[PDB]
Design a protein around this ligand. Sequence first.
Ligand SMILES: Nc1nc2c(ncn2[C@@H]2O[C@H](COP(=O)(O)OP(=O)(O)O)[C@@H](O)[C@H]2O)c(=O)[nH]1
Length: 161
Amino acid sequence: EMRILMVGLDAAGKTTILYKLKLGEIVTTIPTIGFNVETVEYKNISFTVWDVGGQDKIRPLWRYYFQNTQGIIFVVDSNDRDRIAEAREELQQMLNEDELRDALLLVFANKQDLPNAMNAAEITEKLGLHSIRQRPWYIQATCATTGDGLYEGLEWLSTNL
Ligand SMILES: Nc1nc2c(ncn2[C@@H]2O[C@H](COP(=O)(O)OP(=O)(O)O)[C@@H](O)[C@H]2O)c(=O)[nH]1
């Protein structure tokens, strides 16, 4: 019916976020070698999760698992300063996929419990979110392990959908 695509580098906290929603079992599928998909199905909504960044294995086939995406959730480890530039590049490629041009964008600046984590303002500038045109976006500072911030960010995505 409608899909929410939640993607980001490995260890960003996406699986942690799926489990905190308590909207259904997390199911892992491996449609092809090197492509692990995690899926939660709640009513008419499908939450679809996989890791981006690095080799981008089976990238040309991602379109056939993108379909009917109404909102993108980009999750970043705010403490991972080593890979923030990689997260920016991976986000930009998602923002250029034709099947996702109309999808809303929620950004979770995750792991705000860590002492040296970049704040949402810094994450906003590092991701280049203000260069996004004609697409509504929103960024929330979160701690997925406590759940802090997830409701406020998903409140924006849900009310705007
Ligand atoms: N400190 C901290 N750790 C987190 C947070 N969210 C997730 N983690 C940890 O990061 C690791 C990877 O989380 P995971 O959900 O598997 O990330 P994924 O690979 O993107 O799905 C786990 O050990 C989590 O406990 C957070 O907000 N703060």
